[PDB]
Design a protein around this motif. Structure first.
Motif, PDB file in Angstrom:
ATOM      1  N   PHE G   1       0.762  -1.178  -0.018  1.00 37.37           N
ATOM      2  CA  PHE G   1       0.090  -0.289  -0.024  1.00 37.37           C
ATOM      3  C   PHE G   1       0.739   1.258  -0.153  1.00 37.37           C
ATOM      4  O   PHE G   1       0.276   2.281   0.380  1.00 37.37           O
ATOM      5  CB  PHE G   1      -0.783  -0.188   1.358  1.00 37.37           C
ATOM      6  N   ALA G  12       3.504   7.127 -15.698  1.00 37.04           N
ATOM      7  CA  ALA G  12       2.972   7.394 -16.890  1.00 37.04           C
ATOM      8  C   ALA G  12       3.928   7.725 -18.084  1.00 37.04           C
ATOM      9  O   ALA G  12       4.166   7.119 -19.007  1.00 37.04           O
ATOM     10  CB  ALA G  12       1.703   8.046 -17.101  1.00 37.04           C
ATOM     11  N   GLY G  13       4.958   8.574 -17.746  1.00 35.98           N
ATOM     12  CA  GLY G  13       5.923   8.923 -18.452  1.00 35.98           C
ATOM     13  C   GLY G  13       7.491   8.753 -18.139  1.00 35.98           C
ATOM     14  O   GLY G  13       8.278   9.396 -18.647  1.00 35.98           O
ATOM     15  N   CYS G  14       7.662   7.745 -17.042  1.00 34.62           N
ATOM     16  CA  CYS G  14       8.932   7.546 -16.569  1.00 34.62           C
ATOM     17  C   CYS G  14       9.907   6.722 -17.864  1.00 34.62           C
ATOM     18  O   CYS G  14       9.528   6.513 -18.801  1.00 34.62           O
ATOM     19  CB  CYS G  14       8.731   6.633 -15.519  1.00 34.62           C
ATOM     20  N   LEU G  15      11.067   6.953 -17.271  1.00 31.19           N
ATOM     21  CA  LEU G  15      12.060   6.287 -18.150  1.00 31.19           C
ATOM     22  C   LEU G  15      11.844   4.857 -18.551  1.00 31.19           C
ATOM     23  O   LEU G  15      11.953   4.594 -19.868  1.00 31.19           O
ATOM     24  CB  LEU G  15      13.485   6.290 -17.519  1.00 31.19           C
ATOM     25  N   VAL G  18       8.644   4.723 -21.173  1.00 28.73           N
ATOM     26  CA  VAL G  18       9.075   5.033 -22.621  1.00 28.73           C
ATOM     27  C   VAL G  18      10.013   4.250 -23.165  1.00 28.73           C
ATOM     28  O   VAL G  18      10.020   3.801 -24.280  1.00 28.73           O
ATOM     29  CB  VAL G  18       9.448   6.669 -22.527  1.00 28.73           C
ATOM     30  N   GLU G  26       6.804   2.341 -30.549  1.00 29.00           N
ATOM     31  CA  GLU G  26       6.749   2.882 -31.917  1.00 29.00           C
ATOM     32  C   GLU G  26       6.991   4.202 -32.373  1.00 29.00           C
ATOM     33  O   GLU G  26       7.603   4.526 -33.542  1.00 29.00           O
ATOM     34  CB  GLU G  26       5.187   2.478 -32.365  1.00 29.00           C
ATOM     35  N   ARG G  27       7.168   5.089 -31.634  1.00 29.24           N
ATOM     36  CA  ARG G  27       7.491   6.553 -31.564  1.00 29.24           C
ATOM     37  C   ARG G  27       9.054   6.662 -31.848  1.00 29.24           C
ATOM     38  O   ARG G  27       9.407   7.554 -32.395  1.00 29.24           O
ATOM     39  CB  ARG G  27       6.655   7.409 -30.740  1.00 29.24           C
ATOM     40  N   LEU G  28       9.817   6.026 -31.004  1.00 30.04           N
ATOM     41  CA  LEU G  28      11.037   5.645 -31.220  1.00 30.04           C
ATOM     42  C   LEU G  28      11.329   4.826 -32.389  1.00 30.04           C
ATOM     43  O   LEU G  28      10.250   4.354 -32.985  1.00 30.04           O
ATOM     44  CB  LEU G  28      11.810   5.052 -30.117  1.00 30.04           C
ATOM     45  N   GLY G  29      12.495   4.604 -32.653  1.00 29.69           N
ATOM     46  CA  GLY G  29      12.788   3.740 -33.717  1.00 29.69           C
ATOM     47  C   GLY G  29      13.153   2.329 -33.314  1.00 29.69           C
ATOM     48  O   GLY G  29      14.231   2.054 -33.085  1.00 29.69           O
TER      49      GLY G  29
END
Lengths: 147, 176, 298, 87, 295, 49, 49, 303
Positions: G1, G12-15, G18, G26-29
């Protein structure tokens, strides 16, 4: 260390299978004839059947016994979450508003956001204010109360 | 004529803050057409002092006093300047009488009593009754003050005229 | 529509004889259901020391009303009356009915404890059925008496509440209980009084701005009268202060929304108080006057 | 007005003393002024003493004497000299 | 019992009725004075010192000049750029031309057209109509977005293969405002709306009626046309499509003057309007004398 | 860690652009407690005086 | 907890999001042919579905 | 009086259509006039539905219509039954709202539900059967209240500031479902409602006595609680917007008079009932039974 200790009390719920023994003809049951009552609407009619039964105990003492034979699960989490008094005593505030806001922010409790009929009902009459968690993985929260 | 009475009461209630006094006007076919009178949406007015400064802006000037910059990305101080400019206009109540009438006869048909120095009749195809506020902060009012009148129609088009306080008040103030 | 009620306690013949005297009483039920236990009869479910008249009135609104029909050895038969028909009912109120009265239902203010049917900390408490004027009068007397509660130190206000407690209704006199106990007011009555005061205070502030907003659209004479009335109110209210009340024009949207929503939510609290529920109409009353025939208006 | 604004420790007695201050009015005849100004002054002094939370008198049959609040003794006796000169 | 303010207002009545003209004497209106107005009770002072009136008239003069100074700026910019390039100007609008034409007379006609346009230009010229949308509040944000879209880097293969659509560019057809001056019978048409698109085969401009028909006044020798784009670029075009191109600078005027002269109006909610924005309006709430009033 | 170099020094780890993009796209928190966290200000100023 | 046991992996946006979420990949190659153990835990859209 | 009403479908019915109709038995269909024989064009709200015209107009039209219950699709004929006051009927709920035992129901034009799908009932060419929403009293009360609040707030404001506030106001959450009011427009009906509200508020302000005005201030000085804190926030913001005046303590009551208070409170209650009538709909059904799948209920009809 704040200078005092505290004891936590927690209740957990188990799901069990029961076993009972009862002596022969230990109780006398008398049943009466059924009674049928009609309730008529336009599209359909509903009938109600009622049976009256009388029971009298014929034992000089206890003629039935019970055993908790088997258990297979814990309903509660057996966790360590403490009881939120701000939920159980929602009307109480500190008389100085700034320190009240500071305490509430520090404890992680959110003030009722706006004056609303549900908020008034929660304050005056009470309601299931806690709301469920998004995901439950350990069962019910067995809240620990502190002394 | 109810608009004039209501506006007088409203300006009396607001005088302590606004320091604006009421000015009652009548409009006819000499200022707007029949279609314009039938479709009128809003009337707005603005107060301008002797120096050419609008009432709603800051006394000591604004950023707007700076020259414009020709940059499309800047527009012209776009959003802030738009907000400052809109803030200076004020909205007034109005009622339209869409059929030909004689003004004095109409007023006497209502409860008003009329007693003029000369009782010449005035005939008009239609009438718009509105009240504008004139600002007198010092409890003084200068004849060089200017007042603007704006009429707005549903498509958003508008027509503006401006008046200076001398023409509005020369003999009326000297009488009091 | 028949409802069966069963007693799982142990009735005596004295209890049955005490129960049979209520043959035509009005008994409220929490919900319509074919077979119920005796715990759900009457108002005893809801009684607690922290709540009082307002909560019981609100609860009685949503309950369902039934009449009684005579008893089996252990089971009570209840009848749900249909609209428009006529029935015989028992006068449990403190006053006498007469032909043409409209009868309201109210929580009992006092008893007599003369004939309470008590079965192990449970007892059958029934509401009062009284004519509409009496219900109105005592409701608003209680509401006024709640407002006086906060400053009862002065002698004149004590005399006022003393006069306010006593009520006379066509040759019957009795004393209404004081809603304040130990210099404190219960939470439901406190919320009622707070709501009505808040409604008045909010109206006094908001009305002028909304008069202006509506007058911009059209300037009828009614708005002129409202404007004059509000100007008079502000002038009289400000007589004890210097300068001006100085109401501004550039109100923030959120403040306006919050004020309007608060006004309406406070209005919603009072809706149980402002209206009496009238469900009966007495055609014929017996000379004994303890029972009467009435038309059901539920 | 200033008393109505002030946050006293208890509003109860302040309320009735402010009411007394509000009640004051002068009559047409000059012989009644002394007693009404006496009661107005005693209520004002009680309010002032409450404001700085001094232990005002409460003995049976006793009443608060009229005196200046938080003035230096030299200034008090100067004002007393001025009033004596008026006499 | 007391007397209402409305009763004494009615009984007191009016005693004045006076005609007042605006400063430029365009419009006349009547002023009513009520003898029961609260205006009477105030202690009001009034004075009209001459220097204040003189300053007010100077400020009023400054208010009027805002459009004409802008027109003069466009004119002197035209002359400046014409001097700068030595009178040699390139074709910029699509039209066929002949070497046998006597271009001296059309130069003379261009001179006459310049004089006539400067004589007739007014507040309703294409310049004011073109700059007015710039003063709208959304304008600055839209320009920022347009610039940020215009200069973004070329998409990598990943974004082409995956995810969102390609960001659309500006439409090929633009809306311009123009002033058309005809010499043979003196006639100037101010603030005409036109649609401009760039020809594919040659990068010249083609102007069309809002209905889609081709505007033909490039072929008429006696008419010169001034175009202004929403980017505040202006072309002065004489027949044959040869044009003089420059930008309409307006830094000669303060922000306040331009803004308070002709910032666009924005509406407020009233009867008949949808509470949601952008909805289709119902019928206009007319009040009319042809019909009985609804009550 | 030396064996991990095949991952630890690839450019994607050190490029924060996607993290920043999604951080902006989510937007600032609206919870009142978070608001106190939102209100910092930084100003460039000349070093002259 | 707790809130999380790795801020750099569970946000949501951490290393690590991504890096291992296939929607960010997909947005990277990235070469889809290679297998990745982390994919099942980070492919939030598939888990939601 | 006509109890059973015949409706004739002027369009040939397929097997699927009669299947839909026999599924729809016991639904609530409104009728413009209590005639003996009607065409199918008169059924439902489709004869009146009009976007760009607003919600309040449709609400008024629906409030004037008469309600019927559907039964007996019998081959190009359907029979509608007009209920009688006080009797017990079975009702089918066709909306997404969750019914519960014991509450009162009101009829309102349909709101916009979240999934955006809606999906059609019978569709005979260009005609479509659209039914009203039978809704419990709290939700109808909330809808009317928010509609009036939106009307009062929106006047004389620009679209820019009203955008966010209106987007917030239009959204309803009721028993774990989300709805939006579809088409609010400032209209004559809403304006006369606002005028009545304004008159009632002015009379309430005029009537209120000194002690009912000062009760909240006395509590604020005497007591402290979360509810009182919430009330005092509003009152303090109003006072501070008005003047720099600190919270004045109330005075001793000047004229205590029980009879004056009683008469004044009676007048106040008259005005409050008048203000309440603006938002309280007419109750048409009281439920006491519900199917566990929340598809039908047994209800008592109220005129």
């Amino acid at each position: 260390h704040p200078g005092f200790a505290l004891t936590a009390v927690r209740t957990d719920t188990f799901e069990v299978d029961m076993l009972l023994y009862s002596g022969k003809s230990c109780t006398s049951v008398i049943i009466n004839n059924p009674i049928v009552t009609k309730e008529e609407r336009d599209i359909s009619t509903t009938y109600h059947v009622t049976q009256n039964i009388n029971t009298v105990d014929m034992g000089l003492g206890y003629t039935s016994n019970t055993c908790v034979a088997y258990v297979n699960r814990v309903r509660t989490d057996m966790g360590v979450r403490v009881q939120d008094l701000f939920r159980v005593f929602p009307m109480n505030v500190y008389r100085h508003d700034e320190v009240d806001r500071w305490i509430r922010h520090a404890a992680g409790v959110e003030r009722p956001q706006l004056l609303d009929t549900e908020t008034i009902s929660m304050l005056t009459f009470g309601s299931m204010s806690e709301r469920n968690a998004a995901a439950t993985v350990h069962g019910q929260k067995a809240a620990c109360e502190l002394i | 004529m109810e608009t004039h009475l209501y506006s007088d009461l409203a300006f009396e209630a607001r005088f302590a803050d606004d320091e604006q006094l009421p000015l009652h006007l009548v409009l006819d076919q000499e200022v707007l057409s029949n279609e314009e009178a039938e479709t009128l949406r809003y009337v707005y007015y603005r107060n301008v002092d002797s120096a050419g400064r609008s009432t709603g802006r800051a006394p000591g000037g604004d950023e707007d006093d700076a020259p414009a910059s020709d940059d499309a990305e800047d527009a012209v101080g776009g959003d802030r300047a738009f907000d400052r400019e809109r803030r200076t206009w004020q909205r007034a109540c109005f009622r339209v009488l869409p059929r030909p009438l004689e003004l004095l006869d109409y007023l006497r048909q209502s409860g008003l009593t009329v007693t003029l120095e000369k009782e010449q009749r005035v005939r008009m195809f239609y009438a718009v009754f509105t009240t504008l506020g004139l600002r007198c902060p010092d409890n003084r009012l200068s004849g060089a003050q200017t007042l603007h009148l704006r009429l707005v129609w549903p498509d958003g088009s508008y027509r503006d005229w401006e008046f200076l306080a001398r023409d509005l008040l020369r003999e009326e103030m000297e009488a009091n | 529509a028949n409802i069966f009620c069963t007693f799982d306690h142990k009735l005596s013949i004295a209890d049955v004889g005490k129960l049979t005297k209520l043959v035509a009483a009005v008994v409220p039920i929490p919900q319509r259901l074919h077979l119920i236990k005796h715990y759900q009869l009457g108002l005893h479910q809801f009684v607690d020391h922290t709540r009082g008249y307002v909560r019981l009135r609100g609860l009685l609104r949503n309950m369902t009303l039934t009449l009684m029909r005579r008893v089996e050895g252990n089971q009570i038969l209840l009848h749900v009356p249909t609209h428009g028909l006529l029935y015989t009912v028992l006068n449990t109120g403190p006053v006498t009915w007469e032909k043409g009265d409209a009868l309201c239902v109210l929580p009992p203010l006092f008893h007599g404890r003369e004939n309470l049917l008590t079965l192990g900390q449970w007892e059958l408490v029934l509401p009062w059925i009284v004519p509409m004027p009496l219900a109105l009068e005592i409701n608003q007397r209680l509401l006024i008496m709640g407002l006086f509660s906060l400053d009862r130190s002065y002698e004149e206000v004590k005399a006022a509440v003393q006069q306010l407690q006593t009520i006379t209704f066509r040759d019957a006199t009795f004393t209404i209980p004081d809603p304040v106990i130990d210099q404190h007011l219960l939470i439901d009555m406190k919320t009622a009084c707070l709501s009505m005061s808040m409604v008045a205070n909010l109206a006094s502030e908001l009305t002028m701005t909304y008069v202006r907003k509506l007058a911009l659209e059209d300037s009828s004479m009614l708005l002129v009268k409202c404007q004059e009335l509000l100007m008079r109110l502000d002038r009289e209210r400000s007589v004890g202060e210097p300068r001006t009340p100085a109401r501004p024009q550039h109100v923030s949207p959120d403040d306006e929304i919050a004020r309007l929503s608060a006004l309406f939510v406070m209005l919603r609290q009072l809706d149980d108080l402002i209206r009496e529920q009238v469900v009966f109409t007495v055609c014929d009353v017996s000379p004994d006057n303890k029972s009467a025939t009435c038309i059901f208006k539920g | 007005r200033r008393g109505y604004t002030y946050p006293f420790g208890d509003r109860g007695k302040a309320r009735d003393h402010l009411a007394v201050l509000d009640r004051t009015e002068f009559d047409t005849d000059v012989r009644h002024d002394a007693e009404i100004v006496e009661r107005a002054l005693v209520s004002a002094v009680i309010l002032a003493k409450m404001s700085v939370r001094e232990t005002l008198v409460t003995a049976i049959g006793q009443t608060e004497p009229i005196a200046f609040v938080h003035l230096k003794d030299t200034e008090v006796q100067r004002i007393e000299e001025n009033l004596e000169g008026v006499r | 019992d007391e007397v209402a303010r409305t009763d004494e207002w009615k009984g007191a009545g009016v005693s004045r009725l006076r005609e007042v003209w605006d400063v430029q004497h365009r419009v006349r209106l009547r002023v009513l004075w009520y003898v029961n107005s609260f205006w009477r009770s105030r202690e009001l002072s009034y004075d009209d010192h001459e220097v204040e009136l003189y300053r007010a008239l100077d400020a009023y003069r400054a208010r009027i000049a805002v459009e004409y100074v802008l027109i003069r700026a466009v004119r002197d910019e035209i002359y400046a750029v014409l001097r700068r390039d030595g009178g040699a100007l390139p074709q910029r609008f699509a039209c066929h031309v002949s070497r046998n034409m006597s271009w001296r007379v059309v130069w003379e006609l261009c001179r006459h057209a310049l004089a006539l346009w400067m004589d007739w230009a007014d507040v309703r010229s294409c310049i004011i109509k073109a700059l007015t949308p710039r003063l709208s509040r959304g304008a600055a944000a839209a320009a920022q977005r347009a610039r940020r879209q215009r200069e973004r880097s070329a998409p990598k293969p990943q974004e082409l293969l995956f995810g969102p659509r390609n960001e659309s560019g500006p439409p090929a057809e633009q809306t311009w405002y123009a002033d058309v001056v005809r010499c043979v019978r003196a006639q100037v048409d101010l603030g005409v709306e036109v649609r401009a698109a760039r020809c594919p085969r040659t990068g010249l401009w083609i102007v069309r009626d809002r209905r889609g028909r081709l505007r033909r006044w490039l072929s008429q020798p006696e008419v010169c046309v001034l175009y202004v784009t929403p980017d505040l670029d202006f072309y002065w075009v004489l027949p044959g499509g040869f044009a003089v191109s420059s930008r309409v600078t307006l830094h000669g005027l303060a922000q306040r003057a331009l803004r308070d002269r002709f910032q666009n109006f924005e509406a407020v909610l009233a009867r008949g309007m949808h509470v949601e924005a952008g909805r289709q309006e119902p019928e206009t709430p007319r009040v009319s004398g042809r019909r009985l009033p609804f009550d | 860690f030396v064996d991990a170099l095949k991952t630890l020094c690839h450019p994607v780890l050190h490029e924060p652009a996607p993290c920043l993009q999604t951080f902006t796209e989510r937007g600032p928190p609206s919870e009142p407690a978070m608001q106190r966290l939102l209100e910092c200000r930084f100003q460039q100023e000349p070093m002259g005086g | 907890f707790a809130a999380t046991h790795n801020p750099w992996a569970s946000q949501a946006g951490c290393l690590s999001d991504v890096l291992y979420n296939t929607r960010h990949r997909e947005r990277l190659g990235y070469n889809s042919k290679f297998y990745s153990p982390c994919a099942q835990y980070f492919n939030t859209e598939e888990i939601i579905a």
